[PDB]
């Protein structure tokens, strides 16, 4: 297990932090959050969606075909 003070080397980097009792826990939750969700959805929709759309079409066709095959045809 590693420990702080032995992780890596860093130089010339300043970090400004504010106390949690000094700031909001939900700053602009909807006024800023909803735009960010839409940005992230657009960036990944084309990678995630087409596979499951392909599943949905194969699912419905296979179920429709299985239903029709079980119904008899006139001789």
């Amino acid at each position: 297990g590693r420990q702080f003070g032995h992780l890596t080397r860093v130089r010339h980097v300043i970090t400004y932090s504010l106390s949690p009792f000094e700031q909001r826990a939900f700053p602009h939750y909807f006024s800023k959050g909803i735009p960010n969700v839409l940005r992230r959805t657009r960036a990944c929709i084309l990678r995630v969606a087409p596979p499951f759309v392909a599943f949905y079409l194969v699912y419905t066709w296979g179920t429709q075909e299985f239903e029709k095959s079980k119904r008899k045809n006139p001789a």
Partner: protein, 49 residues
């Protein structure tokens, strides 16, 4: 003013300015082990008290 001070005065005066107050922290140098601000802030009270 100094003679007025006894142990009670120090406990009351210090709690007024230290206990459960938000500190200001300034760090410079090899400060990777400097505790996180939340951990510092949690150091300003005692769960036992």
């Amino acid at each position: 003013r100094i003679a007025e001070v006894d142990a009670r005065v120090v406990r009351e005066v210090c709690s007024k300015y230290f206990y459960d107050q938000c500190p200001a922290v300034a760090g410079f140098g090899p400060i990777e082990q400097l505790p996180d601000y939340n951990r510092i802030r949690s150091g300003m009270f005692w769960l036992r008290f």
